[PDB]
Each structure stands twice: as C-alpha cells, then as structure tokens.
C-alpha cells in the first residue's frame with residue numbers, strides 16, 4: 114500500500130527508465146544474470162551466453178529487457194490496481210517458466226542497483242523508498258497467486 118505521494122515518486126523515477134528503456138532493461142538483466150548465474154539457466158534463449166561481453170553484445174537480450182520493463186511499467190502506472198495485468202504474469206511465471214519468488218526478489222534489487230548506477234546522486238532516499246515499496250507490492254501480489262497455485 115502506497116500513498117499518493119509515494120506513487121508520484123515511483124512514476125517520476127519511471128520517467129528516467131522510459132527515456133532509455135532498452136538500456137535500462139539490458140543492464141537490469143545483465144545485473145541479474147551475472148549476480149545470480151542460476152537465473153540464466155531459466156532462459157533457454159540466453160543460456161548460451163557465457164561472458165558479460167556476449168551479454169552486452171546480444172540484441173535479443175536488449176529486446177527482452179524492453180519486454181520486461183514495458184510490462185513492469187504498465188503495472189506500476191496502475192498504482193496498485195493491477196489485478197488484470199498481474200494475473201497472467203503470475204500464471205506464466207509459475208506454470209510455464211517455473212520462476213521461484215526468490216528470483217523476483219533478485220530482479221527487484223537489481224532494478225534498484227541499476228538506477229543508482231545510471232543516475233548516481235539523482236536517485237534520492239525518498240525515491241528509493243517508494244520504488245522499493247512498489248516492487249514489494251508487485252512481488253507480494255505475485256506471491257499470493259503462487260500460493261494459490263501451490264508453486265514453490
């Protein structure tokens with residue numbers, strides 16, 4: 114549960130992402146894969162990437178970063194009223210991709226890391242608080258659907 118002022122902060126931060134969605138999406142995924150190499154094994158289309166240079170050179174990885182962040186941005190713009198947008202993603206991630214909730218924690222922290230890396234000094238403590246709360250709400254509503262499905 115976020116206040117109006119917290120949502121305003123989230124959507125202000127998101128404007129930074131929308132100015133370069135592919136560059137942000139690429140870096141989020143590279144941070145996830147290099148920090149947590151087990152996550153790469155869930156992607157049949159990226160498992161061939163052995164080095165970070167190959168990851169950086171991959172145009173399909175940048176494409177997928179755009180898909181991921183476009184979906185997250187659509188959810189965030191709903192300011193918590195995201196049941197219809199979140200349900201299919203929870204279902205596909207539990208039943209088809211088999212993504213444990215832990216990996217959603219990993220990517221949430223990766224988003225925070227990338228925002229500080231690309232905007233040092235321009236991602237303030239209030240903005241980090243609100244973004245963190247928004248990602249926690251997203252993860253928590255997914256977790257509820259995972260529990261319904263019995264997925265661990």
Ligand code: HEM
Pocket residue numbers: 152153155156157158180181182184185201202205206210212216217220
């Ligand atoms: C911010 C969190 C995330 C968002 C918004 C997101 C969004 C999406 C979307 C929109 C798709 C395509 C449609 C679909 O299959 O439902 C996708 C595919 C996928 N997601 Fe996620 N995702 C997230 C996190 C993750 C994480 C943490 C992993 C794994 C570590 C992951 C693994 C996958 C895989 C394996 C695919 C299929 C890729 C394919 O082979 O082309 N997702 N995701």
